[PDB]
């Protein structure tokens, strides 16, 4: 079994800001999300192989995860507030997607999304 590279985190070609929003989605967000209980399972590429989910790659074709939006937000990888939004985003449809509602792990991701949407609702301006 292989999983696939992970998602670009590093792309000298790609333009990058550094936005108060941004600065948020980081020193706010991020953090708060990452410290969760149930934050453990997103803090990663989801491995196909180690979790024995062959399929996990063939159903899920824009993976995403915490730790990938981490290095994006850490390494300024991004130009607007919506690129990160969006990766956490599809990191939860992803999971909502793959697996059958009332999983532990989308009970996870449930908690965690409604974190990240009291925490968005008090972004600053752009
Ligand atoms: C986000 N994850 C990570 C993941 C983790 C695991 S897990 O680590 O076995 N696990 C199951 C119970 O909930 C806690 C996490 C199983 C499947 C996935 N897949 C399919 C994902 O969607």
Same mark, same amino acid.
């Given at each position: ?6 998602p ?20 706010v ?16 590429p989801?491995? /196909?192989?180690?979790?024995?989910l ?7 074709k824009?993976?995403?995860?915490m ?16 690129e ?8 939860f ?5 793959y697996?059958?509602p ?6 996870? /991701? ?17």
């Amino acid at each position: 079994s292989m999983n696939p590279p992970p998602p670009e985190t590093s792309n000298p070609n790609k333009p990058k800001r550094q936005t108060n929003q941004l600065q948020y989605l980081l020193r706010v967000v991020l953090k708060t999300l990452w410290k969760h209980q149930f934050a453990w399972p997103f803090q990663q590429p989801v491995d /196909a192989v180690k979790l024995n989910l062959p399929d996990y790659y063939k159903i899920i074709k824009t993976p995403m995860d915490m730790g990938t939006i981490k290095k994006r937000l850490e390494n300024n990888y991004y130009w607007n507030a919506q690129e990160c939004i969006q990766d956490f985003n599809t990191m939860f449809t992803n999971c909502y997607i793959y697996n059958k509602p009332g999983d532990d792990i989308v009970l996870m /991701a449930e908690a965690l999304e409604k974190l990240f949407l009291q925490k968005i609702n008090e972004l600053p301006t752009e």
